[PDB]
Write an enzyme that holds these catalytic residues in place. Structure first.
Site, PDB file in Angstrom:
ATOM      1  N   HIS A 253       0.864  -1.189   0.000  1.00 53.05           N
ATOM      2  CA  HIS A 253       0.000   0.000   0.000  1.00 53.05           C
ATOM      3  C   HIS A 253       0.895   1.232   0.000  1.00 53.05           C
ATOM      4  O   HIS A 253       2.122   1.126  -0.068  1.00 53.05           O
ATOM      5  CB  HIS A 253      -1.095   0.006   1.080  1.00 53.05           C
ATOM      6  CG  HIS A 253      -0.604   0.239   2.469  1.00 53.05           C
ATOM      7  ND1 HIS A 253      -0.084  -0.781   3.241  1.00 53.05           N
ATOM      8  CD2 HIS A 253      -0.557   1.354   3.237  1.00 53.05           C
ATOM      9  CE1 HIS A 253       0.262  -0.304   4.417  1.00 53.05           C
ATOM     10  NE2 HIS A 253      -0.034   0.982   4.457  1.00 53.05           N
TER      11      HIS A 253
ATOM     12  N   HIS B  58       1.649   3.739   2.036  1.00 55.42           N
ATOM     13  CA  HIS B  58       2.281   4.381   3.185  1.00 55.42           C
ATOM     14  C   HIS B  58       3.786   4.131   3.233  1.00 55.42           C
ATOM     15  O   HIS B  58       4.325   3.256   2.558  1.00 55.42           O
ATOM     16  CB  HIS B  58       1.617   3.931   4.479  1.00 55.42           C
ATOM     17  CG  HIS B  58       0.244   4.467   4.676  1.00 55.42           C
ATOM     18  ND1 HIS B  58      -0.682   3.844   5.490  1.00 55.42           N
ATOM     19  CD2 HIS B  58      -0.345   5.607   4.235  1.00 55.42           C
ATOM     20  CE1 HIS B  58      -1.787   4.558   5.518  1.00 55.42           C
ATOM     21  NE2 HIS B  58      -1.618   5.635   4.764  1.00 55.42           N
TER      22      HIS B  58
ATOM     23  N   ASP C  69       5.832   2.799   5.388  1.00 60.32           N
ATOM     24  CA  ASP C  69       6.406   1.506   5.762  1.00 60.32           C
ATOM     25  C   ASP C  69       6.371   0.494   4.617  1.00 60.32           C
ATOM     26  O   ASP C  69       6.881  -0.618   4.777  1.00 60.32           O
ATOM     27  CB  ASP C  69       5.804   0.937   7.063  1.00 60.32           C
ATOM     28  CG  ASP C  69       4.309   0.671   6.996  1.00 60.32           C
ATOM     29  OD1 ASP C  69       3.682   0.972   5.975  1.00 60.32           O
ATOM     30  OD2 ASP C  69       3.778   0.153   8.017  1.00 60.32           O
TER      31      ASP C  69
ATOM     32  N   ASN D 145      -2.623   2.819  13.115  1.00 62.22           N
ATOM     33  CA  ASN D 145      -2.966   4.006  12.334  1.00 62.22           C
ATOM     34  C   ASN D 145      -4.176   3.712  11.455  1.00 62.22           C
ATOM     35  O   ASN D 145      -4.108   2.851  10.569  1.00 62.22           O
ATOM     36  CB  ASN D 145      -1.792   4.429  11.446  1.00 62.22           C
ATOM     37  CG  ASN D 145      -2.166   5.547  10.484  1.00 62.22           C
ATOM     38  OD1 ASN D 145      -3.040   6.362  10.770  1.00 62.22           O
ATOM     39  ND2 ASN D 145      -1.523   5.574   9.331  1.00 62.22           N
TER      40      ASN D 145
HETATM   41 ZN   LIG Z   1      -0.340   1.970   6.263  1.00 60.33          ZN
HETATM   42 ZN   LIG Z   2       1.912  -0.405   8.962  1.00 57.11          ZN
END
Ligand SMILES: [Zn+2]
Ligand SMILES: [Zn+2]
Ligand SMILES: C[C@@H](O)[C@@H](C(=O)O)[C@@H]1N=C(C(=O)O)/C(=C/CCCO)S1
Ligand SMILES: [Zn+2]
Length: 231
Positions: A83, A85, A87, A179
Site C-alpha cells: 500500500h 504508506h 512503511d 494508524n
Molecule cells: Zn499503512
Molecule cells: Zn503499517
C-alpha cells in the site's frame, strides 16, 4: 525464535526463513517516541528474488539489500509495495537506484503521489476490484477490498502456504487499532472475510507488524477493528 521489536536496532534488518525460498524481513522505526517493528517478504523466483515491501525508509531498505546480498546472495529483481504508506514504499527510490523494478497497483501509485511519498515505477493491472487476484512470479497478489487503506494488497506464496497480510492484518499482541487515518473501518471485516475465503489453506500468516501466527490473526484483526468501530 522470530525476531522481536526489542532485538533489532533501528537501521538494522533481520531475515527469518519461513520455508524453502521464503523469508520475512524485519526492521524497526522510531515513531512518536516508540519503536515499532515491521515485516515484509522475500520470495525466491528461480535464481532471483522478489521483494514484498520496503524496510520502512531509505536507510533500512539499503540495509535490507545489503543483508539479502550477504545472507542469500541472489539478486532482488522486482519489488511490490502493498500500500501507499511509508512503511511499504519508503525506500522505493533506493530499490530503483539499485536496479530493482518496483511495482504497485495504480491505486497505490496515485495515493503515494498525493501523499508525497515515493512512487513505485510499474503499475500492476488486474487488482482494481475487491476479490481480484493475479499471479506475480512465485506469489499471488490479492486485493481484498479496503481495510487498513483503500489500496491494500495481500500476498500469498502457494508453494509455502504463506499469507502475508501487510498492515491489513494485526498481530495477536496488538489489542487496539493502529494508524487508521486512511482506513475503511466499515469494510475492513468484509475485506478480511474475503482473505479467509480465498486462502483457507494458509498455514503461516504474517502481519504488517509483529509476530506471525495462523489464520487466527484474521479473526483477531476483525475483533480489534470492530471494537474500535464501537469505541
Ligand atoms: Zn499503512
Ligand atoms: Zn503499517
Ligand atoms: C508510517 C505508516 O507507514 C504507518 C501506516 O502504514 O499506517 C505505519 N504502520 C502502521 C499500522 O498500523 O500498520 C502504524 C501504526 C502505529 C502508528 C501510530 S505506523
Ligand atoms: Zn522497469
Amino acid at each position: 525464535e522470530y525476531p522481536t521489536v526489542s532485538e533489532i536496532p533501528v537501521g538494522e534488518v533481520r531475515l527469518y526463513q519461513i520455508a524453502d525460498g521464503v523469508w520475512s524481513h524485519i526492521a524497526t522505526q522510531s515513531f512518536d517516541g516508540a519503536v515499532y517493528p515491521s515485516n515484509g517478504l522475500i520470495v525466491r523466483d528461480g535464481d532471483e528474488l522478489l521483494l514484498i515491501d520496503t524496510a520502512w525508509g531509505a536507510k533500512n531498505t539499503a540495509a535490507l539489500l545489503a543483508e539479502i546480498e550477504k545472507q542469500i546472495g541472489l539478486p532482488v529483481t522486482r519489488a511490490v509495495s502493498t500500500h501507499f504508506h511509508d512503511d511499504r514504499v519508503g525506500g522505493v527510490d533506493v530499490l530503483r537506484a539499485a536496479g530493482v523494478a518496483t511495482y504497485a497497483s495504480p491505486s497505490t501509485r496515485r495515493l503515494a503521489e498525493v501523499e508525497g511519498n515515493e512512487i513505485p515505477t510499474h503499475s500492476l493491472e488486474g487488482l482494481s476490484s475487491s476479490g481480484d487476484a493475479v499471479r506475480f512470479g512465485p506469489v499471488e497478489l490479492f486485493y481484498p477490498g479496503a481495510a487498513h487503506s483503500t489500496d491494500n494488497l495481500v500476498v500469498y506464496v502457494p508453494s509455502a502456504s504463506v499469507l502475508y497480510g501487510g498492515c491489513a492484518i494485526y498481530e495477536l499482541s496488538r489489542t487496539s487499532a493502529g494508524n487508521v487515518a486512511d482506513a475503511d473501518l466499515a469494510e475492513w471485516p468484509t475485506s478480511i472475510e474475503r482473505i479467509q475465503q480465498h486462502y483457507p489453506e494458509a498455514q503461516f500468516v504474517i502481519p504488517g507488524h509483529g509476530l506471525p501466527g495462523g489464520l487466527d490473526l484474521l479473526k483477531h484483526t476483525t475483533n480489534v477493528v470492530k471494537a474500535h468501530t464501537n469505541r
